[PDB]
From a paper:
Among the neuronal KCNQ channels, KCNQ2 and KCNQ3 form homo- and hetero-tetrameric channels and are responsible for the M-current, which contributes to the stability of the membrane potential. Each KCNQ2 subunit contains six transmembrane segments (S1–S6): S1–S4 form the voltage-sensing domain (VSD) and the S5–S6 constitute the pore domain (PD). The C-terminal domain (CTD), which contains three helices, namely HA, HB, and HC, interacts with the calcium-modulated protein calmodulin (CaM). Here we report cryo-electron microscopy (cryo-EM) structures of human KCNQ2-CaM in complex with three activators, namely the antiepileptic drug cannabidiol (CBD), the lipid phosphatidylinositol 4,5-bisphosphate (PIP2), and HN37 (pynegabine), an antiepileptic drug in the clinical trial, in an either closed or open conformation.
To reveal the activation mechanism of HN37 on KCNQ2, we then determined the HN37-bound KCNQ2 structure (KCNQ2-CaMHN37) at 2.5 Å resolution. In KCNQ2-CaMHN37, to our surprise, there are also two HN37 molecules bound in each KCNQ2 subunit. One HN37 molecule (HN37A) binds in the same pocket with RTG and CBDA. HN37A mainly forms hydrophobic interactions with residues Leu299, Ile300 and Phe304 in S6I, Trp236 and Phe240 in S5II, Phe305, Pro308 and Leu312 in S6II, and Phe104 in S1III. In addition, HN37A forms two hydrogen bonds with residues Trp236 and Leu299, as well as the π-π interaction with the Trp236 side chain. The other HN37 molecule (HN37B) is located at the interface between VSD and PD and switched by S1III/S4III and S5II. HN37B also mainly forms hydrophobic interactions with surrounding residues such as Val233, Trp236, and Tyr237 in S5II, Phe100 in S1III, and Met208 and Met211 in S4III. KCNQ2-CaMHN37 is also in decoupled conformation, with activated VSDs and a closed gate. Although the two HN37 molecules induce a 1–2 Å shift of the VSD, the activation gate remains unchanged, with the shortest diagonal atom-to-atom distance of 4–6 Å at the activation gate. For the HN37B-specific interacting residues, mutation on Met211 attenuated the left-shift of the G–V curve but did not change the current amplitude; in contrast, mutation on Phe100 did not alter HN37 sensitivity in either current amplitude or voltage activation. These data suggest that HN37A is more potent than HN37B in the activation of KCNQ2.
Author numbering:
A (entry chain A), B (entry chain B), C (entry chain C), D (entry chain D): 70 to 184, 195 to 330
Write the structure that this text describes.
Amino acid sequence: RNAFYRKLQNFLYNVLERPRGWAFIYHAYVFLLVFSCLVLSVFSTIKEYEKSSEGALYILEIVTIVVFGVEYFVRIWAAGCCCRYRGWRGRLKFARKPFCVIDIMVLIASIAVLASALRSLRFLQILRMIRMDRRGGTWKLLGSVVYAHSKELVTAWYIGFLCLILASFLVYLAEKGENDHFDTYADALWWGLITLTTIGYGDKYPQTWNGRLLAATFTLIGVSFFALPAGILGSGFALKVQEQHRQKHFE
Amino acid sequence: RNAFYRKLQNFLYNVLERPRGWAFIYHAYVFLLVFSCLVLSVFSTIKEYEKSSEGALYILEIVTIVVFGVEYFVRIWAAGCCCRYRGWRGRLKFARKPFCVIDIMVLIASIAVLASALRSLRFLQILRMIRMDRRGGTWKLLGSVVYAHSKELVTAWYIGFLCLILASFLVYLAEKGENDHFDTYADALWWGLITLTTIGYGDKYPQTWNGRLLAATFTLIGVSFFALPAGILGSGFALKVQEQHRQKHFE
Amino acid sequence: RNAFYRKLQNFLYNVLERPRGWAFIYHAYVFLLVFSCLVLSVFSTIKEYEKSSEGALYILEIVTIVVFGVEYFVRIWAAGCCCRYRGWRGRLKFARKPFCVIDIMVLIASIAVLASALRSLRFLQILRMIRMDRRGGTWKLLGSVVYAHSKELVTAWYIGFLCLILASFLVYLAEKGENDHFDTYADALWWGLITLTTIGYGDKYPQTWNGRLLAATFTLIGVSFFALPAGILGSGFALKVQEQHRQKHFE
Amino acid sequence: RNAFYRKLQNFLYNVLERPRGWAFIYHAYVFLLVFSCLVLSVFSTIKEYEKSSEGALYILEIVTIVVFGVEYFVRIWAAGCCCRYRGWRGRLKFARKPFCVIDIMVLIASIAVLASALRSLRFLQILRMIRMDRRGGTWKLLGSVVYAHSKELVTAWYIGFLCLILASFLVYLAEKGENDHFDTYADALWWGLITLTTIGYGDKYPQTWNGRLLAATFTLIGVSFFALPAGILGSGFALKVQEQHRQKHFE
Ligand SMILES: C#CCN(Cc1ccc(F)cc1)c1cc(C)c(NC(=O)OC)c(C)c1
Ligand SMILES: C#CCN(Cc1ccc(F)cc1)c1cc(C)c(NC(=O)OC)c(C)c1
Ligand SMILES: C#CCN(Cc1ccc(F)cc1)c1cc(C)c(NC(=O)OC)c(C)c1
Ligand SMILES: C#CCN(Cc1ccc(F)cc1)c1cc(C)c(NC(=O)OC)c(C)c1
Ligand SMILES: C#CCN(Cc1ccc(F)cc1)c1cc(C)c(NC(=O)OC)c(C)c1
Ligand SMILES: C#CCN(Cc1ccc(F)cc1)c1cc(C)c(NC(=O)OC)c(C)c1
Ligand SMILES: C#CCN(Cc1ccc(F)cc1)c1cc(C)c(NC(=O)OC)c(C)c1
Ligand SMILES: C#CCN(Cc1ccc(F)cc1)c1cc(C)c(NC(=O)OC)c(C)c1
C-alpha cells in the first residue's frame, strides 16, 4: 500500500502547491468563502444589520478556521512529495519558509481572536487576501512589465504632471475672486487632480469664462496624458502574452 | 422546376443561417424593429406618454410576431438544404435543437401574452435580444481571449483589489469624525469603488487634508489598475485579429 | 517665361491639393482662422459679451471670405497642373466635382449672409469644418479599421448591452420604493447608461444596501465592457500603422 | 594619485550626467526632496497650517540650495571626463550650454529670493521640475510617436470634434426652454465637452426626454471617439518598445 500513497501525495501536493488547471477550482471556492467572511464583516460594521451579520459571521469564521487548519496540515504532510523535503527533518525544515510560518501564525492569531476586536479581524482578513498569491508571481510580472516600459511611463508621468501644474495654476489665476471654489492654490490643485483623472466629483468647477476657456484646452490634453499609463501597461501585457505564446509554440 | 427550387433554398438557408456579408442587412433590420419595440415599451413605462407609446406598441408587436413566425417557418423549410436534415424525418429532428425550440416557445408565449403583463413582455424582449446570437460565438470568443490573458487579468484584479482596500481603510481612518460622509467602513468602501472606477458621483468625497493627501496617491494608482483590464482585453482582441488575418492571408 | 510658370503651378497645386509635409502649415493657419471665427460666434451667443464678439467677428468674417475666395480661384487656376484637367474645357469640367461646387456655393451663401441670421452662420461654419477633409480619408480609414475588427466590436456591444439591461433592471427592482431617483424603468436605464460609461453625473445613484451591493458587481463588469471598443479601435490603428510602416520600409 | 582621480571623475560624471541604472537612485532622492519642498509650499498657501509649513520650508529650502550648488560644482569639475571638455578653457566653454546656465541662474535667483515673494518660489520650483529632464528626451520620444501616428490622431480628432458639435447643438435645440441649464449655446458646448470626456461634473445634464434620448446615442459615440487618442498613443508606445527590444536583441 505505497503506490496509492505516493500517487495521492503527489497529486495533492501538486493541486495545493502551484496549480495549473482545474486545481484552481478549490482555490476559487476557498477564496469565495473568505470573501463571504469579509463581506459579512463589512455588513457587521453597520448597526442596523449587525444582528444577522454576526450570527452568520461567527459560524463562517469557525468554518474557515477549520478549513485553513486542515489545509495547512495536509500541505505539511504532502510536502514530502518534493525530492528536497523528505522525512522528519525535511518536513521540519520546510516550515521555515516565510509563507508557511505566516500561515501558522495567522491561524493561531485568528483562533485566539475568536476564542471591539473586529479591527484585528479586518487586518487578518486583508492579510489572508494578501496570502492568496503565496509566490509573488503577480508582483514579479508587474515589475517586469513596468521595467520594460520604464521610459514611456516616465515620459507620460512627466508630461502629465507638468500639464496638471500648468492647468491648475492658470485656472486658479483666472478664478481667484469670482468663484469661491478656488480660494487657495491647494483647492485648484485638488480640482485639477480630480478633473484630469476624469473622476469629476463636481464639488469644484470653473464658472467664469476664463476658467472654462482654459479648461477646454488643458483638460483635453491632461485627460489623455493621464489615461496613457494604463493603455501602455495593457498593451505591454498583451504583447508579452503574444510573444510568450509564440515562443512556447515554437518549443 | 427543381434547379430554381434548390437555388432558392440554398441561398435562403445561407442568409437566414450563418451569414457572412450583405445577409446581415436583414438581421440589422429585424434587430431595429425589435429595438424599436423595446424603446416603445420603455416609453410606455411612463404615465405621461403611455397613450401614444401603447398605440404604437400594439401594432408593432403584432408586426414583429408575424415576422418572427414567417422567419421560423421559412427557416424550417430551408433546413433541408443541409445534407444532414433531409425529408420529413430530417426536418422533424431539426426542431430538437435548443434555439429552434426556444424560438417556437417564444413566439407562442408572446402571441399568448398579446392575445399588468408588461413585465412578461420585458422579459421576453430581452430574451429575444439574447437570441440574436443563435450560436454563442460572442461568448466563445470572449472566453478564448480571457483564457489566453488569464495571468495578467488575475494580477491586475489582485493589485486593484488590494489598492481599493488599502485606500478605503486609510481614508476611513483619516475622516472618521471630521466628515459625515465616511461614518462607516461600508461608506468608505463605496466611495473607493466609485472613485477608482472614475464614476465619481460626488455623493461622498474627502474634505480633511489627510483624506485629500492620501487620495492624491492611492486614487492615482487605483485608477490605472482599474482601467488595466479593459486595455488588456482590447489589445488581446486586436492582436488576435492581426494574427488571424495574417494566417488566413498565408492560406 | 514658362519654366517658372509651370514650376509655380505645380508647387501651388501640390500644396493646395493633397499635401504631405510643410504644406500643412497653411492648412493649419486657415483652420486656426476659421476656428477663431467659430469661437467668436459662440461668444456672440451670449448677451454680456455680445459687443466685442460682433466687433471682432464682422472683420474676421470678411477676412475669411476674402481668403476663401482667393484660395478657390488659385486652386481653379492651378488645376491645370494635372494632365487630365487642361485648358479652358479642362478647367470648366474640373468644377463639376462635389467639393469644388460645395466650396463655391458656400462662399456665395456666406457672402450673401454677411451682405437673426446667426443660425445660418453656425450651420455654414460647421459645414466649413466638414469641408476640411476634402477627400473623406478620415472616413475611409475609420471604416476600414472598423470592418477589420467587426467581430470583436459586435461581441463587445452585445455583452455590454446585456450587462446594461440586467444591471438596470436589477437595480430598479431593488430600489423601486426606497429611493425616489428610481421611480420608473426609464430612470433606471438612464442611471445605468450614465454609470457604465463612467460619466457619473450624480443626479441618480443607489442608496439602499441592495442597490449598492448589486452595483458593486454589475458596474465593475459593465465599465470594462463599455471601455472595450475604444481600446480595440486604438490597438487596431496602432497595429495598422506598424504593418504599414514595415511594408513601406520593405519597399 | 591619478588612476583613482580619473576613475572617480569618470564614475561621477556618468552618474550625474546620463544615467542608466542605479544612478537613478540619487536622482530619485533629489526629486523627492524638491517634491517635499513643493508640497510644503502648497500647504503654506493656506492660513490654518501656515506656521508649521513655513517652519519646515525655510530649512528645507536652505538644504536644497546647498545640495543644488554642490551638485552644480561637482558636475562642472567632472565635466573634464569627456574628451571634448578639457582643461580650463574646456570647462569654461562647457557652461555656455542652455541647461548649465539655467541651473546657475536658477540657484542664484533662489538664493537671492531666500536671502509676498512666494509666487517667485512657485515659479522657480516648477521650473526646477522642468529641469529634471536636462535632455528633452521625453519631448523627443513623444514627438516621434505622435508623428508616426499622425493620420489616426487627425482622424480621431476630426470625428470627435464633429460628434461634439452635433451632439451639443442637438441637445441645445431639444432643451432650450425646458431646462435652465442649457440657456445659451456656450452652455451646451460646455456640457458636451464635460460629458464626452466622461468627467461628468453634474452641473448640467439633460432632463427632457428629447435630450436624454439624443444623448443615449451621441454620448455613446463621442465617449469612444474621445478615448481613442490615449489608446492609440499607448499602443504606439508599447509597439515601439517591442520593436526596439527585438532589434537590440538582434544586435
Ligand atoms: C516630474 C516627474 C516624473 N518623475 C518622477 C516621478 C516618477 C513617477 C512617479 F509616480 C512620480 C514621480 C521623473 C521624471 C524624470 C524626467 C526623471 N529623469 C531624470 O531625472 O533623469 C535625469 C526621473 C528620474 C523622474
Ligand atoms: C500623468 C500623470 C501623473 N502621474 C505622475 C506623477 C505622480 C505624482 C507626482 F508627484 C508626480 C508625477 C501618475 C499617473 C498615474 C496614472 C500613476 N499611476 C499608474 O501609473 O499606475 C500604473 C502614477 C503612479 C503617477
Ligand atoms: C484578490 C484577488 C483576485 N482573485 C480572485 C478574483 C478573481 C477575479 C474576480 F473578478 C474576483 C476575484 C485571485 C487572486 C489570486 C492571486 C489567485 N491565485 C491563487 O489563489 O493561486 C494560488 C486566484 C485563484 C484568484
Ligand atoms: C482592479 C480591480 C477590481 N476587480 C477585481 C476584483 C473584483 C471583485 C473582488 F471581490 C475582488 C477583486 C475587477 C475589476 C474589473 C474591471 C472587473 N471587470 C472586468 O474585468 O471586465 C472584463 C472585474 C470582474 C473585477
Ligand atoms: C445586441 C446587440 C448588438 N447588435 C446590434 C447593434 C450593433 C451595434 C450597435 F451600435 C448597436 C446595436 C448585434 C448583435 C449580434 C449578435 C448580431 N449578430 C446577428 O444577429 O447575426 C445572427 C448583430 C447583427 C447585431
Ligand atoms: C458596450 C456597449 C453599448 N454599445 C452597444 C449598443 C448600443 C446601442 C444599442 F441599442 C445596443 C447596443 C455601444 C458602445 C459604444 C462605446 C459605442 N460607441 C463606439 O463604439 O464608438 C466607436 C456604440 C456605438 C455602441
Ligand atoms: C477638425 C479638426 C481636426 N483638425 C485640426 C486640429 C487638429 C488637432 C487639434 F488638437 C485641434 C484641431 C484637422 C483636420 C483635418 C482633416 C486636417 N486635414 C487637412 O486640412 O488637410 C487638407 C487638418 C490639417 C487638421
Ligand atoms: C476627439 C476629440 C477632440 N480633440 C480634437 C480637437 C480639439 C480641439 C479642437 F478645437 C478641435 C478638435 C482632442 C481630443 C484630445 C483627447 C486631445 N488630447 C490628446 O490627444 O492628448 C494626446 C486633443 C489635443 C484634441
